[PDB]
Design a protein around this ligand. Structure first.
Ligand SMILES: Nc1nc2c(ncn2[C@@H]2O[C@H](COP(=O)(O)OP(=O)(O)OP(=O)(O)O)[C@@H](O)[C@H]2O)c(=O)[nH]1
Ligand SMILES: Nc1nc2c(ncn2[C@@H]2O[C@H](COP(=O)(O)OP(=O)(O)OP(=O)(O)O)[C@@H](O)[C@H]2O)c(=O)[nH]1
Ligand SMILES: Nc1nc2c(ncn2[C@@H]2O[C@H](COP(=O)(O)OP(=O)(O)O)[C@@H](O)[C@H]2O)c(=O)[nH]1
Ligand SMILES: Nc1nc2c(ncn2[C@@H]2O[C@H](COP(=O)(O)OP(=O)(O)O)[C@@H](O)[C@H]2O)c(=O)[nH]1
Ligand SMILES: [Mg+2]
Ligand SMILES: [Mg+2]
Lengths: 428, 49, 426, 426, 428
């Protein structure tokens, strides 16, 4: 029947999918061998007498992580040809990942997603987990959108991008990779959201009250927000909307497809004790400006469209009551040309808890994707960082001698700048 | 549905919630004849011998 | 005989038929396993109206449950009483039109429409002469508002002389889901006004308003809102199947409630609707139930009738009644509330007493009132449309798949002339 | 027939009005679950005076209960003889009026008065032809004095012809809680004189006088005060509910006790009232029952009637009794206490016979007098109120709630001329 | 439905509120872990599997007292973010708690107060407990009121000042701290009750015949006062007297909102055996000048309104008889414009005692809040002391060098001088 295929470009993308697929194994109750002891059909195919295999492909150029997935405990969960690894790193180069050491691995990964797509009809789209500052996540990410858009021209794409964060960057040439990635990201993806790293870091610092987590603690949060987004595709709910409705309800112009995200609650074992997590409570907390997942304050911006996914024992009245109190609140500002800016889908099956992780067993939860005019300052600082770096050829000589001519840098400048003028003209 | 099959009335037994401890309804010491409703009381006197 | 061919469009339409068919089957005494029990002549005297014999003694509903996503009628079939329908009447969509009027009506739903047209004339022509078609849907979503009015549009041409009975669930003012509400609502209503003989307006939070304020329901779900409208369908078609002192049918309502053909949008009240704390405390008679009928708090349309004049009014009385008090109790509500009625129609009324009530109740009423109170609802879906449309909102999907800018402009012209006509009659 | 819509306002009116319903259920043979017990014809042949059948053979009171805080009406509803009322007849407030007339009248009471007017119109218009209203409230609190008399001003204007009786408890002079007593008293009365045609006053310190001196209760709770005034309000409306040799409704009392529309304030007394130690000692004869009735020690209002002058008085007798002894004892008290009766109206006194006594009593009288002696307590709360305004007492919470200063001086100006009008008939 | 939010600033507020919620848990049958083995809604919030969580923000700039609560038995009762703290104390300075160091804590104090007050509509008001003679009780104690006045305006604001003694000080800059905060609570507090420390010291020495009570024993009598004050909200009675009735019947003008307190009986097991607690004598002991809880002598002051909180098996006819005896007594005196000067309320639940405390079991009690013109002396001993600091610059540099300017000493002094003139002209 219906299925959706995930693609994982970059080390960050594969580690996001690593917490994703162990979470889906808990959700559908399958062991890491794939064999159970028909709601799983949108993520898992069939194999033999009871095995299931994910419709995922783990695409890097570095073998130190892809072969480490093969060697680890989740070996036979994945079909071994779905994990495609290269030879050598792009090494924070958009030039290497897109031109030189990409041509021998895009054609191989295209064959694997070809054989993964024709197995059944009823596909909704693709879910590409990738980072932005990395050379592989921007380089192979650009070429994969370029090839998938020209032949699958009517199918949706879900570019979950780990955008660079404001205070910390843990990279040097990553403003170069970010502007070059959006040069081709605008015309090739259908839905994209920004998941900045220190916005998530702040979330797990004052909701979990843990001050030195690791990468796996954030990837559990991204796994939880993908699982809460696609729970409508899997479990039956009173009001169910899925990937087709996202492509037509949250992106009112063809070129604005950048959204935020949040979750509520993100509570530990001790913090589940001392409050009941009412629907109105987990909507106010999700709408808190400090609760966003992109360091993207909506206090000095106007919301454009909003979407919330209620999961668990939610009742259809207080979804309307929490939305009503949000309308009455003056701190949250909407846009003039959208009087009815609220969409939601309610589901019955509550989010599972990983035993030994950091979440707590909650009766209900809220996923969030919200388009707003507040990403203008998110990309305007990528403009400012790129200005003083591209003054007098910082690290440009190894992008220009190794695959592209000088001028693609300038073309990426007005492509991101026209996105700023697009964000300005919508609000006014 | 929480209503009945053909009756348009709720069918869910009872789900109440009282407010207070809720006693001392001020048991009136006047019956319908209103005398005093006498019980044996204190006499207030000296030693009756 | 006279037979109703039922069509359910959308997720709202399939759920609202997944409660109406239950409340009409137990009224006929039918088990979920299709076997009659109840040893009464009156229940089987008109069962061909809504059912067909199966040469096994079991009765199948003459419904067609249909939309573009399989999760809706799989949950109907898995639910109780959902087995009664044919998998032949069930038609399946797999890709789904998601909250989209245009690709429901033109590209996707037209692929499915040539096969659901096959199953609707088979339930239509299979009898000697049908009474009409009952189509229940909502004007908010994609498949139930876009392609839902496509089948309203086409049944007009091959079957012009028969009545077009439709329930439509209009968008909610203050808290509405399905972000493109007015683009689905206004682009459907023009096909819904020259291809439907009478349409009843049901509003979502007005169903909630009956739940919280008159039923005192602490926990209403979608099933509790669905009973309120399922009683409205049951009362309006009761006198077709069940006898009474004064007969009434769908054309009986049509010729007496529409004076001018462009306006056929009806308000619905249902009485009695008791909070169960006072169910054992409320007397049940005509002179107490008529003001529950004529009441804003018992309105499943969210328009206050006190902001307008009743153009025409009617009431499908039901139960063991007195058919003198059937009519001076509404004589009272006319000569007291004189300003709440139009002037150039004297005698605005129609009572229609039907003898057999719903089970247990000794009295019941569905109320059909053609009033200018719906002006506020049509203006409100108009300015919510035009505030969006002035800045090109959510439209590049609609234009890119078989529509253009021109079609939306007459969508607001025949939306706006509904308000302009109701001020002509105000 | 003839019906009285009973109305309760404030936490006083909820708890002394609730007492009125089981003292009226006891005479009418009503089980607290609503059924009838006692197989007597003349108990139920006038039952529509205060009760309505509820299509199950049970009787629900025609009572409308108001308070701006839900605590005391929870105490009424869930107590014994308190589940008899319909829950919809209860109307809840949330914020509460804090013993101030301004918030009960203008700001908070306006949003609650629209639901009360809907339900009191529901009860009055539902039956054939009303007879009047009964109003039980307080003048010491905020919700009973502000919102209750705002109800009095509105119910005067849709229904101007009918009779509007009140049993009101006024602020006590000697004992005094709720330090804004003169404000809530004066602001009630100044427009209570014009929108009410019959007002009867009970003083709580006189209720302490009657329970200490005549009943000799060792520890009288509030229930004795609630019940004694309940015997007073039952004896006035006796003839509406049970037949009598000399018939008199309270409209007949309204004509016969006020000569001018400005003065309509009355004294209430009740007889007989003896202890258990004197229960089977006192003789129950008409001469003893009337000499006990004309006593300031028997009075339920704290104005001494000997200090003033009785303009017109009335005595609603109850019980099978010889009838010229009713007449000649009234001439006996008139010809003996000639100085305490006004001379320009010959035979100031009225009597009627209600043939059915209260249960357990052979004879009983309620006494509605109209004496000019009540200017003692109107003037003494005017002297308290002019001690307040002369030094700006609590004024900001009586001027910040949407109302200004000039109606305070207006309230005094049209109250000291009530004392002056009584002075020039003294 | 209804609720009241407790506020506790300063370590005096923390440990007074520790005794208050120890009395509230013991009254409603609530274990310190939360589970009771619906009158509790006034203070506790129902959540989860039948457990209850207090609605009390705990503010203190030094964690030396609040993490002692976090390590004491009442740590699974409160939510961890219900108890909030900074790093560094104010060290007895108004200027520290209002100009320099109170910012990083107050921005999250209002963040918690918004999600504690949105729980249920119909909220009555706030009950702040502060130490006016201290540093953060005056400083952050001031700063929190401008935030509550500008945000939650119309709602009632109760304040319980830990008033410094005329001769006992335990600080030398407490005339600076008290003047600068009483100046601001004059127009930012609806109802304020003075609670002098020596006034509780001598009342345990006299009425309990206990010769070594301490801070915690003082907090038990204060807890008994506040529990009886809110006992109308939490329990049924003949005359219910909620929070709005305190305002409308005690405070006559927006400036004159300072009121004394008294509680009687407060009797140990030695004397409760021998005395019968009649209504007449518990109100004579409540009205006697030695039982005032402010060291504010009322023989030379004029009462104008007294609230009487009867708590127990009290018939109201004894109340009306007892207040009549108070009227006939000539040792007290009432002002000319109040012939009516009593607001009595009856509550039916008797006040419980803690097992092992210094109060014996009691059948009825009286909690008195009285407004009198005797408060001029407790502000004139203030006036003479603060003048002789101000003569030659005592401790001024610990304020002017830390945010504020020199001159607010004069502005706060003249405002309290206008309070003296206001109290003088009313009493004549
Ligand atoms: N949320 C999240 N972010 C990650 C994770 N791993 C890496 N990142 C982000 O990725 C950035 C580092 O670049 P990578 O994404 O690892 O680079 P890449 O996509 O592997 O491309 P190459 O390094 O050339 O192979 C850092 O700034 C991180 O913020 C992860 O596990 N979770
Ligand atoms: N009523 C009462 N007062 C107390 C208690 N403990 C301390 N105090 C008062 O607190 C005053 C001193 O205030 P501080 O020690 O500065 O405490 P603070 O108000 O929080 O100010 P900082 O310590 O600077 O944060 C003393 O005068 C005491 O009277 C107590 O348990 N009960
Ligand atoms: N009466 C009723 N209304 C519903 C139900 N489910 C959703 N709705 C309303 O209808 C809207 C969604 O319409 P939908 O069923 O998705 O339309 P569709 O997408 O065309 O099938 C929401 O805004 C809801 O307010 C239901 O079960 N019953
Ligand atoms: N007759 C009577 N008077 C009462 C009763 N209870 C209280 N009162 C008086 O009413 C006044 C209190 O006002 P209250 O009704 O409690 O305030 P409110 O609720 O805002 O109207 C006091 O002066 C009492 O003397 C009662 O049961 N009967
Ligand atoms: Mg890498
Ligand atoms: Mg401190």
């Amino acid at each position: 029947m219906r299925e959706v295929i995930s693609i994982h470009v970059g080390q960050a993308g594969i580690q996001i999918g690593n917490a994703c697929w162990e979470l889906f194994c808990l959700e559908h109750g399958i062991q890491p061998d794939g064999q159970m002891p028909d709601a799983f059909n949108t993520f898992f195919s069939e194999t033999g007498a009871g095995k299931h295999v994910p419709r995922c492909v783990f695409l890097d150029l570095e073998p130190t992580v892809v072969d480490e997935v093969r060697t680890g405990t989740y070996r036979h969960l994945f079909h071994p040809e779905q994990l495609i690894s290269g030879k050598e790193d792009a090494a924070n180069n958009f030039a290497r990942g897109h031109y030189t050491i990409g041509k021998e691995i895009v054609d191989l990964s295209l064959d694997r997603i070809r054989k993964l797509a024709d197995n059944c009809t009823g596909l909704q789209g693709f879910l590409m987990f990738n980072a932005v500052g990395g050379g592989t996540g921007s380089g192979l990410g650009c070429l994969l959108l370029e090839r998938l858009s020209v032949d699958y021209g009517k199918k949706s794409k879900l570019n979950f991008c780990s955008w660079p964060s404001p205070q910390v960057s843990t990279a040097v040439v990553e403003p170069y990779n970010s502007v070059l990635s959006t040069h081709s990201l605008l015309e090739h993806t259908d839905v994209a959201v920004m998941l900045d790293n220190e916005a998530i870091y702040d979330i797990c610092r004052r909701n979990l009250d843990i001050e030195r987590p690791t990468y796996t603690n954030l990837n559990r949060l991204i796994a939880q927000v993908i699982s809460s987004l696609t729970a409508s595709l899997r479990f039956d709910g009173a009001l169910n909307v899925d990937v087709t409705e996202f492509q037509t309800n949250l992106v009112p112009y063809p070129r604005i497809h950048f959204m935020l995200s949040s979750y509520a609650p993100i509570i530990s074992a001790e913090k589940a004790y001392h409050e009941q997590l009412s629907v109105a409570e987990i909507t106010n907390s999700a709408f808190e400006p400090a609760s966003m997942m992109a360091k993207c304050d909506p206090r000095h911006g106007k919301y454009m469209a909003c979407c919330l996914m209620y999961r668990g024992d939610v009742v259809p009245k207080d979804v309307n009551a929490a939305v009503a109190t949000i309308k009455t609140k003056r701190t949250i500002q909407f846009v003039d040309w959208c009087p009815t800016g609220f969409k939601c889908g309610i589901n019955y099956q509550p989010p599972t808890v990983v035993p030994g992780g950091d979440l707590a067993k909650v009766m209900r939860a809220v996923c969030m994707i919200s388009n707003s005019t507040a990403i203008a300052e998110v990309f305007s600082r990528m403009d400012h960082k790129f200005d003083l770096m591209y003054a007098k050829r910082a690290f440009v000589h190894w992008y220009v001698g190794e695959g592209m001519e000088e001028g693609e840098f300038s073309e990426a400048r007005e492509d991101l700048a026209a996105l700023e003028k697009d964000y300005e003209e919508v609000g006014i | 549905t929480s209503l009945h099959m053909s009756k348009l009335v709720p069918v869910t037994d009872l789900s109440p919630r009282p407010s207070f401890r809720y006693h001392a309804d001020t048991g009136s010491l006047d019956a319908t004849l209103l005398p005093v409703d006498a019980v044996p009381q204190e006499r207030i006197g000296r030693r009756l011998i | 005989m006279r037979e109703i061919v039922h069509v359910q469009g959308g997720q709202c339409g399939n759920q609202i038929g997944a409660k109406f068919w239950e409340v009409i089957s137990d009224e006929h005494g039918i088990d979920p396993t299709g076997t009659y029990c109840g040893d009464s002549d009156l229940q089987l005297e008109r069962i061909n109206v809504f059912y067909n014999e199966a040469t096994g003694g079991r009765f199948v509903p003459r419904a067609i449950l249909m939309d573009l996503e399989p999760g809706t009628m799989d949950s109907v079939r898995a639910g109780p009483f959902g087995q009664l329908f044919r998998p032949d009447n069930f038609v399946f969509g797999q890709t789904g039109a998601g909250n989209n009027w245009a690709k429901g009506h033109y590209t996707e739903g037209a692929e499915l429409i040539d096969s659901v047209l096959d199953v609707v004339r088979k339930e239509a022509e299979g009898c000697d002469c049908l009474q009409g078609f009952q189509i229940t849907h909502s004007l908010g979503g994609g498949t139930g508002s876009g392609m839902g009015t496509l089948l309203i549009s086409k049944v007009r041409e091959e079957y012009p002389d028969r009545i077009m009975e439709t329930f439509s669930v209009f968008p909610s003012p203050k808290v509405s889901d399905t972000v493109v509400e007015p683009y689905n609502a206004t682009l459907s209503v023009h096909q819904l006004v020259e291809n439907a003989d009478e349409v009843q307006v049901i509003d979502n939070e007005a169903l909630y308003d009956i739940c919280f304020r008159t039923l005192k329901l602490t926990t209403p779900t979608y099933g509790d809102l669905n009973h309120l409208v399922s009683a409205a369908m049951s009362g309006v078609t009761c006198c077709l199947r069940f006898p009474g002192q004064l007969n009434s049918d769908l054309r009986k309502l049509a010729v007496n409630l529409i004076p001018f053909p462009r306006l056929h949008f009806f308000l619905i009240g249902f009485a009695p609707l008791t909070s169960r704390g006072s169910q054992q405390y409320r007397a049940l008679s005509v002179p107490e139930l008529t003001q529950q009928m004529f009441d804003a708090k018992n309105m499943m349309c969210a328009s206050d009738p006190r902001h307008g004049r009743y153009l025409t009014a009617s009431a499908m009385f039901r139960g063991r009644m007195s058919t003198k008090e059937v009519d001076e109790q509404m004589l009272n509500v006319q000569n007291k509330n004189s300003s709440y009625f139009v002037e150039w129609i004297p005698n605005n009324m129609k009572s229609s007493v039907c003898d057999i009530p719903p089970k247990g109740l000794k009295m019941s009423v569905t109320f059909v009132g053609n009033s200018t109170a719906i002006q506020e609802m049509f203006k409100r879906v108009s300015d919510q449309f035009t505030a969006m449309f002035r800045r090109k909102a959510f439209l590049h999907w609609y234009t890119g798949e078989g529509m253009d800018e021109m079609e939306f402009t007459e969508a607001e012209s025949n939306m706006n002339d509904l308000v302009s006509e109701y001020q002509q009659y105000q």
